[PDB]
Amino acid sequence: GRVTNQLQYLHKVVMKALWKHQFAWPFRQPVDAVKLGLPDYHKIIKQPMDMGTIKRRLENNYYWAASECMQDFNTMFTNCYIYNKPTDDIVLMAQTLEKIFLQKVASMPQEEQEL
Amino acid sequence: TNQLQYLHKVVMKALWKHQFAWPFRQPVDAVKLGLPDYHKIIKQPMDMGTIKRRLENNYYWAASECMQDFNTMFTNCYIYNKPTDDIVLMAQTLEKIFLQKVASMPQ
Numbered sequence: 401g402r403v404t405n406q407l408q409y410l411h412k413v414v415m416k417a418l419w420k421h422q423f424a425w426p427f428r429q430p431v432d433a434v435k436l437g438l439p440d441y442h443k444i445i446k447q448p449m450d451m452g453t454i455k456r457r458l459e460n461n462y463y464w465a466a467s468e469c470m471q472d473f474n475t476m477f478t479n480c481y482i483y484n485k486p487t488d489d490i491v492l493m494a495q496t497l498e499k500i501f502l503q504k505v506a507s508m509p510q511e512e513q514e515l
Numbered sequence: 516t517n518q519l520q521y522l523h524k525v526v527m528k529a530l531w532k533h534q535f536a537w538p539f540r541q542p543v544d545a546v547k548l549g550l551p552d553y554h555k556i557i558k559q560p561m562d563m564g565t566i567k568r569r570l571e572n573n574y575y576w577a578a579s580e581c582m583q584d585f586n587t588m589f590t591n592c593y594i595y596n597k598p599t600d601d602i603v604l605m606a607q608t609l610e611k612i613f614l615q616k617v618a619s620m621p622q
């Protein structure tokens with residue numbers, strides 16, 4: 401991992417906006433299949449992801465490039481759409497957060513430079 | 516804008532020619548596919564051909580609006596299909612390319 405302009409932006413602009421959002425609470429920690437009573441969750445979702453894990457990775461300089469962090473956000477949202485029923489409210493919550501994610505990504509610095 | 520030209524000439528071009536892109540280049544035809552519930556579940560259909568036409572006709576006012584349409588296309592696929600369907604893996608592969616190319620879009 402390393403520090404880059406784009407990773408700084410993802411941490412301080414993108415994660416900042418998503419973490420505090422009123423729909424963020426289901427995504428701040430890994431899906432807990434015991435707490436939720438979902439014994440098939442890990443049979444369907446093979447790469448769990450959540451914002452707490454992404455945030456710790458940003459804090460610990462785990463990522464080498466901003467695209468790696470973007471892929472983790474994407475996996476978090478895609479797992480939600482794959483696992484849940486189409487009409488579940490969690491899908492709407494993920495959609496709302498993901499639209500913010502994309503809006504902020506559209507304004508990320510263009511060329512990635514190590515700091 | 517420079518961003519929209521990049522989404523058209525770089526991002527869409529890379530996705531469109533990919534070996535997994537054929538299901539996504541035109542709207543889902545629910546009648547031909549025998550999927551009578553498709554439009555009961557998916558209320559905002561989206562596909563690459565629609566996005567490309569919008570790019571060509573200067574429909575979009577901002578890059579994020581175009582990105583939202585790509586996202587809707589992929590999300591619809593994940594919401595409608597079974598988790599184990601090959602189409603879901605095809606969408607995941609294309610979406611990863613989409614994000615990789617978006618990371619280099621000019622600001």
Ligand SMILES: CC(=O)N1c2ccc(-c3cc[nH]n3)cc2[C@H](Nc2ccc(C#N)cc2)C[C@@H]1C
Pocket residue numbers: 425426427430431432436438479480483484489490
């Ligand atoms: C992110 C994701 O896909 N999921 C996820 C993850 C964490 C949490 C959670 C965290 C603390 N508590 N619950 C709840 C859920 C979803 N389930 C519900 C969501 C909202 C409401 C209401 N209102 C009721 C159920 C199930 C689903 C597998």
Ligand SMILES: CC(=O)N1c2ccc(-c3cc[nH]n3)cc2[C@H](Nc2ccc(C#N)cc2)C[C@@H]1C
Pocket residue numbers: 537538539543544548550591592595596601602
């Ligand atoms: C994008 C999307 O979600 N969908 C979508 C759209 C267009 C098309 C299509 C286009 C030409 N022909 N078929 C096929 C499909 C999927 N169905 C299949 C995909 C691959 C294979 C194999 N091998 C068999 C079925 C169903 C699903 C509703």
